[PDB]
Amino acid sequence: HVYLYDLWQTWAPIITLEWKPQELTNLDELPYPILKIGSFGRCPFIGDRNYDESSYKRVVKRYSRDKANKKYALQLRALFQYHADTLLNTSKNLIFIPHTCNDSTKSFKKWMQEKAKGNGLGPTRASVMSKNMKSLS
Amino acid sequence: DIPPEIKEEMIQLYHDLPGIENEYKLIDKIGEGTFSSVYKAKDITGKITKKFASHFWNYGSNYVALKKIYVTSSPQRIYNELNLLYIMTGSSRVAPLCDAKRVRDQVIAVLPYYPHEEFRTFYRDLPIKGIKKYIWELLRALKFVHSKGIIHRDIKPTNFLFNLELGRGVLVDFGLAEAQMDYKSNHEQFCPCIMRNQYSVNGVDLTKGYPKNETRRIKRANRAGTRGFRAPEVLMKCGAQSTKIDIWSVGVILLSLLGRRFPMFQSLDDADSLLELCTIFGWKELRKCAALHGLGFEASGLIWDKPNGYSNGLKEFVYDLLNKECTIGTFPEYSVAFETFGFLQQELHDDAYELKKYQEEIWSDHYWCFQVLEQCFEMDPQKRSSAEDLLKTPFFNELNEN
Amino acid sequence: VKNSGYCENCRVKYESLEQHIVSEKHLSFAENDLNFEAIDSLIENLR
Amino acid sequence: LRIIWGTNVSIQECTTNFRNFLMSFKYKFRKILDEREEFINNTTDEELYYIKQLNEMRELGTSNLNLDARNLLAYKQTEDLYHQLLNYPQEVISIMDQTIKDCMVSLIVDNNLDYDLDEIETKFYKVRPYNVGSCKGMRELNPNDIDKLINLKGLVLRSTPVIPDMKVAFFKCNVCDHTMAVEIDRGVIQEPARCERIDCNEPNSMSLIHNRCSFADKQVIKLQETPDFVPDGQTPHSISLCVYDELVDSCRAGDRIEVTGTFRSIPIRANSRQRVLKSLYKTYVDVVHVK
Numbered sequence: 001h002v003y004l005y006d007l008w009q010t011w012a013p014i015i016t017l018e019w020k021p022q023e024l025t026n027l028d029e030l031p032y033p034i035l036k037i038g039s040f041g042r043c044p045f046i047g048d049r050n051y052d053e054s055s056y057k058r059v060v061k062r063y064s065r066d067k068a069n070k071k072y073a074l075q076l077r078a079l080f081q082y083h084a085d086t087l088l089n090t091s092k093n094l095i096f097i098p099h100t101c102n103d104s105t106k107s108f109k110k111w112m113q114e115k116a117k118g119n120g121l122g123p124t125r126a127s128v129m130s131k132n133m134k135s136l137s
Numbered sequence: 138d139i140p141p142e143i144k145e146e147m148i149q150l151y152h153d154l155p156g157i158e159n160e161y162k163l164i165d166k167i168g169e170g171t172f173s174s175v176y177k178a179k180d181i182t183g184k185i186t187k188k189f190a191s192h193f194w195n196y197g198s199n200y201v202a203l204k205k206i207y208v209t210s211s212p213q214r215i216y217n218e219l220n221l222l223y224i225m226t227g228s229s230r231v232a233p234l235c236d237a238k239r240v241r242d243q244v245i246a247v248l249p250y251y252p253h254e255e256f257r258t259f260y261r262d263l264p265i266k267g268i269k270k271y272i273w274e275l276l277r278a279l280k281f282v283h284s285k286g287i288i289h290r291d292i293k294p295t296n297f298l299f300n301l302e303l304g305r306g307v308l309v310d311f312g313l314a315e316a317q318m319d320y321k322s323n324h325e326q327f328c329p330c331i332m333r334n335q336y337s338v339n340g341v342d343l344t345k346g347y348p349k350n351e352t353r354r355i356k357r358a359n360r361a362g363t364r365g366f367r368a369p370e371v372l373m374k375c376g377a378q379s380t381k382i383d384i385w386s387v388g389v390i391l392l393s394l395l396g397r398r399f400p401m402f403q404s405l406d407d408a409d410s411l412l413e414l415c416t417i418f419g420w421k422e423l424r425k426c427a428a429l430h431g432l433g434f435e436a437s438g439l440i441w442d443k444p445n446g447y448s449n450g451l452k453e454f455v456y457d458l459l460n461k462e463c464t465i466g467t468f469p470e471y472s473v474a475f476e477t478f479g480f481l482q483q484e485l486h487d488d489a490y491e492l493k494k495y496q497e498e499i500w501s502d503h504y505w506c507f508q509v510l511e512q513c514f515e516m517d518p519q520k521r522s523s524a525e526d527l528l529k530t531p532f533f534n535e536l537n538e539n
Numbered sequence: 540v541k542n543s544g545y546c547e548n549c550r551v552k553y554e555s556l557e558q559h560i561v562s563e564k565h566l567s568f569a570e571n572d573l574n575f576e577a578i579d580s581l582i583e584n585l586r
Numbered sequence: 587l588r589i590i591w592g593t594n595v596s597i598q599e600c601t602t603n604f605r606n607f608l609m610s611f612k613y614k615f616r617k618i619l620d621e622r623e624e625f626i627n628n629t630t631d632e633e634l635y636y637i638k639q640l641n642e643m644r645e646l647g648t649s650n651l652n653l654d655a656r657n658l659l660a661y662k663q664t665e666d667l668y669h670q671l672l673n674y675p676q677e678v679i680s681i682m683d684q685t686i687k688d689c690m691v692s693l694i695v696d697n698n699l700d701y702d703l704d705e706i707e708t709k710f711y712k713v714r715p716y717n718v719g720s721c722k723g724m725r726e727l728n729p730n731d732i733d734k735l736i737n738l739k740g741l742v743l744r745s746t747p748v749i750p751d752m753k754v755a756f757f758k759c760n761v762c763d764h765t766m767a768v769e770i771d772r773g774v775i776q777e778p779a780r781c782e783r784i785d786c787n788e789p790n791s792m793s794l795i796h797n798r799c800s801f802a803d804k805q806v807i808k809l810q811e812t813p814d815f816v817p818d819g820q821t822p823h824s825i826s827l828c829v830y831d832e833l834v835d836s837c838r839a840g841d842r843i844e845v846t847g848t849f850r851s852i853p854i855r856a857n858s859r860q861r862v863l864k865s866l867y868k869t870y871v872d873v874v875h876v877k
């Protein structure tokens with residue numbers, strides 16, 4: 001369970017939620033989300049549901065999108081490179097720090113080699129629920 | 138060459154606004170929001186061009202952004218919006234209103250159009266220089282805002298318009314913005330949440346229990362914000378919400394850049410946000426914050442991958458975020474995240490001359506970014522340094538050129 | 540379709556916005572200028 | 587979503603509809619349903635009926651709201667809520683009470699009134715409907731009409747004294763003085779078989795204290811109907827109303843009243859052999875509103 005309460009108990013508890021052990025059987029749908037990171041810059045607490053980073057069709061689509069946006073990213077880096085400003089930067093083309101990291105391009109080459117053969121507002125509501133409401137629920 | 142399916146609503150609004158046909162010509166709809174929609178239009182009469190001409194960024198042609206609020210919004214709320222935008226005119230980082238008028242219920246606000254680029258476009262591929270400049274501008278804007286003595290509850294990249302070609306950005310939405318009221322007429326009694334109303338039997342302890350029949354009231358505190366970008370202060374309904382919730386949101390945006398995760402905190406409710414904070418920081422730390430704010434908190438039985446983990450700091454967190462991307466290879470070859478990856482590899486212990494100069498400078502920049510992140514990410518409000526204090530960081534040496 | 544929300548001006552929740560705007564209460568509220576007097580006070584101060 | 591079992595009522599939808607009706611009711615709608623549009627007033631019809639009523643409810647401090655069901659029929663959005671109210675008295679009435687409390691506290695909050703919400707949330711609000719359709723008499727109420735709103739008019743012949751009704755039992759453990767209080771649910775009290783304490787366990791330690799229980803008022807009123815329609819050769823029939831709480835001692839003998847309430851049926855025990863019930867159910871009427 002998770003329990004957060006007023007120290008002086010003058011006001012009702014804010015969050016009070018408890019879960020039976022049986023509903024916790026699956027690790028994918030915990031009521032309290034887990035840090036299942038996923039990939040492709042998604043939410044850290046969500047992942048690649050119905051998605052596989054190694055799926056060759058997905059790899060090809062992402063590679064095509066990336067090669068489409070190569071020039072724009074290069075323009076961004078050229079605009080912003082160690083001068084802390086744009087107009088001050090006005091007067092070397094690039095700096096590439098090497099890494100052992102795998103990327104879209106290297107993984108793509110590996111795969112090719114492998115296959116080479118509503119509103120936002122709501123009415124204010126009361127806090128105390130009647131006992132008859134509890135019975136009805 | 139524009140979707141006519143938008144043109145029908147354009148002309149509908151046009152004839153719904155009989156005092157605008159001569160005044161302005163509608164160009165296009167540029168912005169969409171939860172509380173309103175934003176329309177681009179041309180200025181028929183040049184007086185508005187002369188008015189706040191300095192305010193109008195002179196990049197490109199001068200256009201005007203039209204603020205068509207939704208009718209459902211409270212007239213009192215709209216009055217707050219227009220008054221707040223009125224009383225911070227001429228700041229060059231806050232957007233000043235130029236005109237405002239209404240037709241019966243419908244109300245339209247005239248704002249200077251700010252040519253910007255979508256946050257989705259560039260968060261992945263922004264050099265740490267870009268983060269530096271963006272955060273510097275944003276903190277200067279919030280410094281002005283807090284100097285004026287208000288709180289802009291909804292702080293998010295969608296509500297901040299930054300231009301790369303100009304290299305500058307301005308805040309626009311002030312929809313949920315709240316003016317800081319008079320807090321009162323040591324820090325342990327600063328905010329134990331006993332303020333304003335309700336200010337100044339033993340043997341029974343509800344430490345491990347929830348009453349069967351509940352006969353007590355809930356906190357009544359403002360909860361305005363966004364899905365995510367919400368501070369522990371407001372998240373636990375902690376009383377006397379301070380301006381520093383804004384800088385907390387700023388730090389959240391900052392961390393979103395460092396990790397290339399846009400939906401950084403997918404919180405479907407308060408519970409999701411609280412548990413996510415528990416994951417990132419630790420059960421004990423969140424309990425300590427709640428105790429500081431005069432609030433009991435308990436959680437047991439839950440399983441965490443990092444049990445009170447990440448106490449090393451946020452470095453390990455962004456570290457394994459980038460680690461899994463590295464193993465997969467999500468990022469492109471030219472992605473600027475790899476330099477950050479190398480920075481964390483080096484610091485966690487886990488021609489060439491220009492190269493060494495460049496890497497030294499990025500060492501320093503990543504260093505200072507990570508020690509300003511922890512500077513902002515602290516639950517204590519009184520300890521949380523103000524926006525001017527953030528700007529006084531050694532990371533912000535580019536203001537020193539004044 | 541998705542235009543379902545809460546009309547704080549009318550303190551009412553609507554399944555459809557296009558019908559709430561043409562609702563009798565909402566139309567009467569729109570036709571009443573007494574609710575917008577404070578707004579007009581700062582509107583005129585612009586000019 | 588989530589209709590209750592045995593009913594056609596969904597809590598969320600019914601609360602939404604009732605709030606909608608409360609916010610946007612004008613007496614001109616009832617005038618339209620009355621085909622009395624030539625009598626439409628510019629002042630009273632314009633003003634919001636129930637919002638104003640809830641206001642004076644707040645200042646005066648009363649806890650009971652009297653609702654005219656034909657007003658619900660007037661509002662298009664709550665035409666179905668009318669039939670839901672007739673067919674399902676208790677559930678819909680509780681829904682209405684919760685919605686009234688919600689609307690009161692919301693109206694205080696939205697205007698930021700200086701009046702404190704301490705009293706409001708602690709108070710219990712009640713909705714008392716009336717003008718619920720026709721009378722139909724009592725000879726014409728088939729057994730399928732059990733637990734429905736009915737409208738009865740007649741003469742109050744006799745009124746019994748106040749009968750205490752147990753609400754909370756006060757069983758006391760003789761051994762360890764474990765005095766547990768048992769609330770009554772659906773007219774049933776469950777005795778602790780042994781001492782509810784774990785350290786002390788003695789089944790005979792329980793001995794109910796009659797005097798320290800908390801009771802509630804109950805008055806039975808004998809009403810002789812005077813239906814608008816009478817079948818051939820039908821002598822007048824007497825029905826037994828059962829009022830509760832504040833309505834006790836309100837209706838005096840000889841008053842010609844019109845009463846609305848829930849048509850109930852209860853087994854009657856054949857006292858020849860204890861705990862044996864007759865298969866014919868006695869019929870009575872719980873009372874919600876008296877005009």
Ligand SMILES: Nc1ncnc2c1ncn2[C@@H]1O[C@H](COP(=O)(O)OP(=O)(O)O)[C@@H](O)[C@H]1O
Nearest residue numbers: 168169170171172173175202251295309310312
């Ligand atoms: N002056 C402006 N220039 C360009 N885009 C704008 C401007 N004002 C608003 N927008 C766009 O419209 C969106 C919604 O406007 P905003 O004032 O934030 O409304 P809301 O109160 O509904 O959130 C912003 O997120 C932004 O994309």
Ligand code: BEF
Nearest residue numbers: 170171172310312
């Ligand atoms: F959706 Be806006 F940021 F009010």
Ligand SMILES: [Mg+2]
Nearest residue numbers: 170296310312
């Ligand atoms: Mg906004």
Ligand SMILES: [Mg+2]
Nearest residue numbers: 310311312313
């Ligand atoms: Mg806004």
Ligand SMILES: [Zn+2]
Nearest residue numbers: 328330375430
């Ligand atoms: Zn506090």
Ligand SMILES: [Zn+2]
Nearest residue numbers: 546548549565
């Ligand atoms: Zn409305």
Ligand SMILES: [Zn+2]
Nearest residue numbers: 759762781786
């Ligand atoms: Zn005992």
